[PDB]
Design a protein around this ligand. Structure first.
Ligand SMILES: CCCCCCCCCCCCCCCCCC(=O)O[C@@H](COC(=O)CCCCCCCCCCCCCCC)COP(=O)(O)OC[C@H](O)CO
Ligand SMILES: CCCCCCCCCCCC
Ligand SMILES: CCCCCCCCCCCC
Ligand SMILES: CCCCCCCCCCCC
Ligand SMILES: CCCCCCCCCCCC
Ligand SMILES: CCCCCCCCCCCC
Ligand SMILES: CCCCCCCCCCCC
Ligand SMILES: [Cl-]
Ligand SMILES: [Cl-]
Length: 398
């Protein structure tokens, strides 16, 4: 946890919105309620105009009507100012310019009152063309996707935000609305001041088919981005698995293990005492240890994997298993990803170099000299597995 405020958003939260506004002197009030869930970066709000008719289009109000509900990924959690200002909350102020038309100025307080997150807003519009897209109610009822750009304002102990909303017009044109935003802590407690990043925002406007009153149902999905997480061998591994249909493979293996005698025999051999001698002797090698530690320090849980290691079938025996898995793997692609990571990943190249090191090859040579290992290979060659070919293929990668 990177802040105390952050812990308030783990679950679903009640939301309340109140707005008072005046646009070209048309005065109105709106109230809304719903729930945010910041884990998923979702929120759901319903609004009603309590004064009678809304003098401006619902879509123009969307941005005005709780960014503390964005989903920040774990690597970005030190960059979330919004949750960090909670519960005391923050002031969010904006100027919104509608191209070729009037502008909105807004001031909102966002903060908890009890268990509820409350957004109270005052809004003033001016200089609107009476025949324009806004007063003329020419906007389609819908919303688009936008990136919301955040940067720290140190002087103000807060953030500066800007973005451009695209409002679709009924004649197929687009009405731009340039947003300039600042957010300020209400409380005197410490807050996170983020590096430059953005919120990816998606929204959808709908109705309650039952609701008779003019209303807007608003659905928002918001996720922070624009800052790369630190990378290591985990991330490289995940990338190879990504290329691999692991579900199919795990199933095929499961099947052979169930219905095939030879596959079961080889598994029995894995708990065999001859095989035990092999594991034991390798585990005894200091250079094997160093290699494991190396993997550990670079993001791999290695020891965890090894110590913790204990009908689609188209084929028969070990070769049947090997062939079925192979038919599945994208060899050319994996091989490409492998070549690429030697270029683009430092950790992966160190890993490669580590394996090619004299230290490591001596682990390999120790193994090659175990007659119990040499016997294991012969046990396979006689079951039809071409080990020598497979062995050469691997030598050739390195
Ligand atoms: C998390 C797993 C850790 C397991 C550690 C396993 C210990 C390694 C034991 C080696 C496996 C034996 C497989 C035999 C392959 C061919 C060996 C060989 O004679 O050739 C080498 C072939 O190259 C290798 O060194 C094989 C590397 C084995 C891959 C083990 C890496 C584990 C990856 C973890 C991620 C060197 O080639 P050369 O042309 O320079 O001579
Ligand atoms: C072949 C490797 C498949 C990975 C399954 C975990
Ligand atoms: C206990 C950690 C040692 C792991 C050694 C694995 C040896 C695998 C050899 C298999 C040869 C095909
Ligand atoms: C299962 C453990 C594999 C160790 C590396 C051997 C590659 C053949
Ligand atoms: C080629 C690899 C054949 C063995 C696949 C076993 C996968 C088990 C998970
Ligand atoms: C994990 C790395 C697999 C490399 C794939 C090379 C295929 C030949
Ligand atoms: C095939 C085994 C290669 C493992 C990848 C090492 C880097
Ligand atoms: Cl401003
Ligand atoms: Cl105002």
């Amino acid at each position: 946890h990177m802040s105390k405020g952050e812990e308030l958003f783990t679950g679903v939260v009640p939301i309340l919105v109140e707005l008072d506004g005046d646009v070209n002197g048309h005065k109105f009030s709106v109230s809304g309620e719903g729930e945010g869930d910041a884990t998923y970066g979702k929120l759901t709000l319903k609004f009603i105009c309590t004064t009678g008719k809304l003098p401006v289009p619902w879509p123009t109000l969307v941005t005005t009507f709780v960014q503390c509900f964005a989903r920040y990924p774990d690597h970005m959690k030190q960059h979330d100012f919004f949750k960090s200002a909670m519960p005391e909350g923050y002031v969010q102020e904006r100027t919104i310019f509608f191209k070729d038309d009037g502008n909105y100025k807004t001031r909102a307080e966002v903060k908890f009152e009890g268990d509820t997150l409350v957004n109270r807003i005052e809004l003033k519009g001016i200089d609107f063309k009476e025949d324009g897209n806004i007063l003329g109610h020419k906007l389609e009822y819908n919303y688009n996707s936008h990136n919301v750009y955040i940067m720290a304002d140190k002087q103000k102990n807060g953030i500066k935000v800007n973005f451009k909303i695209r409002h679709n017009i009924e004649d197929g044109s687009v009405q731009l609305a340039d947003h300039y935003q600042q957010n300020t802590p209400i409380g005197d407690g410490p807050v996170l001041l983020p590096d430059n990043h953005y919120l990816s925002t998606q929204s959808a406007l709908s109705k309650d088919p039952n609701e008779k009153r003019d209303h807007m149902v608003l659905l928002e999905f918001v996720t922070a981005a624009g800052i790369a997480a630190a990378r290591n061998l985990q991330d490289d591994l995940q990338d190879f698995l990504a290329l691999i249909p692991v579900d199919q493979i795990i199933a095929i293996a499961t099947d052979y293990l169930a219905n095939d005698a030879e596959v079961q025999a080889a598994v029995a051999y894995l708990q065999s005492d001859e095989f035990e001698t092999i594991v034991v002797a390798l585990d005894a090698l200091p250079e094997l240890q160093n290699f494991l530690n190396f993997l550990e320090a670079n993001g791999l849980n290695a020891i965890d994997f090894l110590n913790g290691i204990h009908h689609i079938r188209r084929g028969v025996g070990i070769t049947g298993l090997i062939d079925d898995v192979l038919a599945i793997l994208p060899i050319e692609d994996l091989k490409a990803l492998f070549n690429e990571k030697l270029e683009t990943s430092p950790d992966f190249l160190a890993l490669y170099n580590a394996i090619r090191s004299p230290e490591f090859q001596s682990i390999v040579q120790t193994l090659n000299a175990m007659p119990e290992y040499q016997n294991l290979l012969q046990k396979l060659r006689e079951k039809g597995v071409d080990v020598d070919k497979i062995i050469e293929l691997i030598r050739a990668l390195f």
